[PDB]
Symmetry: D3
Subunit: 251 residues, 6 copies
């Protein structure tokens, strides 16, 4: 039950990822064999729920690619349910300040370190109580990544970075650009400056910066700067764009 | 991606609807061909979720009948997820005051006009980014309908009607009658008076009144008065009552 | 595990039925409360399989209406599977002769009386081996109804009626009329004559005649002639026609 | 629609239960025939949602075992949806004080006694309006059980017990032991003392104490003391432990 | 209910296609917007059944791309079921001779022209009896494409082309190459010769040649020779290879 | 893609197994961690299909227990489909003679050794063409186990054992006892004699004997005689009996 993605971030090994919005355990398996370090199961902007997350985790399990799950919001109840089906790495949307970051962290940790409700017998998390001493080992293998997506969140970043248990900070360029006045198009100097400055500040605090970016040159730039969990594409886009290009070649 | 139901309400063309509680993409298609102007996919009182809404939207898509979705509550997160699978017309339950109406409207609109989170690449809403300039066109095709179901909501109606982006106000007679002391039976003079007065006030403000009513004479009365989105039956009731009547004719 | 539908036919008590093509456990429960004696789960012309039959049987179980299941064909493998999930009354399509009727009966009976494969520990049919002496009691509670749908089958009817274990013979007017050249409209004197002559002959042999007929006058005419399992409507039709009628009443 | 579990608790008849985390309508039916007085469908720590609850209720319906449902939290919206698919007995997690207990009770009751939204036509709860006078009978057959799982909740127990409509109080030993410093292992004298004292206080107030405990001697002790709804095992554990023991006997 | 794919082949307009093996209604919709003339829902080599074909047909329906469905074999029972859920164009595997081609055609046609069973009230195919004179118009809109996959089938090609109702003949290079001893690599002169000779001969007879070929140079070569339904890629391949390429570009 | 179950049988290492009839990917994972050498996914007597087999194979994949799948019959079309979703070991029911055993073997092998249809780009079996030289390596990793279930099959056992590619012969005691007139109780000396004589004869030929037997004393007796794949319990039975025992201990 060692969290190898978390260990890698801690060791400063960059992790290359793919976003999964196809919401299917079948395509999840197909993509789990494609050579990515991590896969993001999106519960926020794709039609997933706890049950489809579970089946995608089962599909991915025997592959080297590590799963990360994004809940629909920073919700303790939804976090608890995701952890019980076996989620160990969470990407939490719209974290605006240190208090919200702390709530995310505590949602993942058993008392006294947190408020995670106990339900080990029922849960894939402990493999239905086959993992010995699960309750005592579980906290240290939880990896909490928080998303900063607004000017307010950027302003609060130093404080968010001071929250123990925050292992990484993810920047969402589309949401950030929208908040900043550029309508979801991050290719504006003011937006890139903010992103670059955040990546540096995060890495300087001893924590992992992350980002999703489909432009491969921008992705390489962010990696060169020091980002440690970079998603470089989205399943739905890869499929749609490859199919459209193919049809176009025949008229 | 033009919202034709919204255009019709704006133009004062009455829209006749059917309520869908069967929670099935198969019966949704069957009913999409029956000649209604709109169909209500009920996420509140029928066993639907974002995923079943998605499949019902897919089933209805090639038909002229327009889909409207009712979330379980006035919840920004649930609203965001519904919009991403392609929902453009929402019927929001238990809207009690202008602040709640405004939250519903802003949940549907991209910044700065609202707080809708961006996730276009992943979403059926933009047809996975095939709709050009989706981010810029999306706000104007969202149609927000709010439900008033209590005496408190009736008292606040003038203020609710002043909220920009509120395109229509739906009256739920059963909930209203319950709140007023008549136990969900709207056939009491005090309740009909309130309903009639609301329909008039709504239409006089330049907005669309709506209602669900299974009694066909009452429905015609409300249409005569000026209601613009009137649901005249419920799938489950049509099926149950037709089946029971049939069995009764044979003993 | 007494088959009450089977006992009713044997006692000459007419059974009024509804056809289920909505392929949903939810609408099946709704319809199970409507007052029919029997309900036909259609695995031939509706998108059902062994698994959806199972969920529909579970939904119907606490109600008085008795389930009957139609396999896609007279296939002993499919029959075995349907029996294991708890089917006790089968309506077998396209039975052309006495050998085929015999094959249907034998598919439902444990050796030596038939070729039904044994798997009671696994099966809802024995309630996972809770039903005492299941193996010894099962054969006698199976009820086999065979469909005659062609001129060939009509010619072989006397031999088919001589087959032990054939409890009922069902006439399918649409298929029969199509085979007879009146495709597929059964309102022609020569089709009605064939139908009515078969009903009389079936009942004369001491077996139960059955038919599906949405016209209530014809249904009563068939009952007068001795028909004992008469399906008088179809769920999809009831819903589609009620919905269309409603929408039309509002323009 | 009489709630027989509720009547039994009121009459002081102890009810022996099994916890269902397998989240399957198929295993639910299998277990519904095993002789338990009640079955707990766990929406909190197992991968269930309103839809899977519905199918499990349908599976259990014809059996004598009574269903109890645990929502993911004390959420009025989720409670409403569960009640509409037919839930009449709720086990509500993390109830910390009298105000929270009162919110749980009011979520289950139609106005004026509560805030339950009306949606009878659509709901299995009224059997799609076949239950006559459902709106007037529904409140009295709702049974609300609240979970106390923290030292804070224990402190507030006398006040929680004074809340009308609270029919029972369930103690979760694992969560309680975690809150008390013993890491989810309830076998510590301080924890057993607290549990024993709560069971007595609950029963002395005229209300039903409940608990889940897999140790059969502890369960018998709690029953001897006066507990009235005792779950004595969990489906997932029974299966896992029986399978592991079996494999071990062969090496 | 005009079959536009069928009309295009008859008019000599080449149709460019994509194979769908992802077995999902969600990715089917995504791909339906990509610009292909046709989409192949594979019931033979992908985990589809009648029910998933149905949901994929619903998803594709509002788009210009036309669905074609491949049953698992030339089985008249499976064909009947696929036709009832609305399939109008079938790609039938392993057709070895003219008798088997005739059997495929006849499975799709109502008597007297075939043996298709009647069940229009139940079926999406007639839109639940909304399509006027469905029974009279259906036969002419069925489009039957047969696969030749062995040396035996190649030998019988002239007789197969003489079968009325065979609208197209599809060559499966992998299966053919395997039968020819080059298992299963079709890049050998003798396989290419057999393929190209068949395409010429099929087109010469006035029927449509088809093929699946992921190599775009070969695809254009087959088009030059007169092939009229050419599938130029497979969804699972497009996704797997794009994902693998992306991951490799980042090390 | 080495078949380790197949290698174990060939090396004379007995494999202890559990039968899976719960038809759930969730309980399959739970049971995959219980310590059995193999797990039987039953497509004959449990409500599984190609799609639920797929999800169960995905769930079991990361565990040491090896899956074996039982098709509903010796059907080459069903076998092809199960092989494409990744099945490598098949337990084929009702194999009566050497021709039928040969047909089973040939259904699993690519030409020229068999008639297995080619579709690797689409199939989990090749991991969507990631497995290098899949077509060349697949045949040798297929493991075919045939069930002898009748006196006829027992008579033909010597010829069946002479069939190349038959790796194992499984005796089904319930079906065999039913065929022998002891329906379906296998505790009679003449049934036990037939069973034990077959086990000895199978092993003598250098092939693996198999059997399902819930009685642990009999299971050890069969192992002593040389049986090499012995299923020692059934999931549904384990769960039902443990639950019933528990409930009874509490009255
Ligand atoms: Co974002
Ligand atoms: Co309401
Ligand atoms: Co028929
Ligand atoms: Co608890
Ligand atoms: Co092929
Ligand atoms: Co057997």
């Amino acid at each position: 039950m060692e969290n190898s993605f978390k260990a890698a971030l801690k060791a400063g090994r960059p992790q290359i990822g793919l976003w999964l919005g196809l919401s299917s355990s079948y395509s999840a398996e197909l993509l789990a064999g494609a050579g990515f370090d991590w896969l993001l199961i999106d519960g926020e902007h794709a039609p997933n729920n706890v049950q489809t997350v579970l089946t995608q985790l089962q599909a991915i399990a025997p592959y080297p690619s590590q799963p990360v799950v994004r809940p629909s919001w920073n919700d303790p109840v939804q976090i608890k349910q995701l952890l019980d089906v076996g989620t160990q790495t969470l990407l939490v949307p719209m974290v605006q300040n240190a208090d919200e970051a702390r709530e995310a962290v505590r949602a993942t940790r058993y008392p006294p370190a947190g408020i995670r409700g106990v339900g080990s017998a029922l849960a894939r998390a402990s493999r239905w109580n086959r993992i010995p001493d699960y309750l005592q080992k579980a906290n240290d293998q939880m990896c909490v990544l928080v998303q900063i997506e607004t000017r307010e969140a950027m302003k609060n970043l130093p404080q968010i970075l001071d929250v123990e248990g925050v292992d990484g900070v993810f920047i969402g360029p589309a949401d950030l650009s929208a908040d900043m006045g550029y309508a979801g198009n991050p290719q504006h100097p003011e937006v890139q400056a903010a992103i670059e400055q955040a990546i540096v500040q995060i890495r300087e605090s001893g924590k992992a910066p992350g980002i999703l970016i489909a432009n491969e040159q921008l992705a390489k730039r962010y990696l060169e700067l020091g980002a440690l969990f970079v998603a470089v594409g989205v399943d739905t886009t890869l499929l749609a764009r490859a199919a459209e290009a193919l049809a176009a070649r025949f008229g």
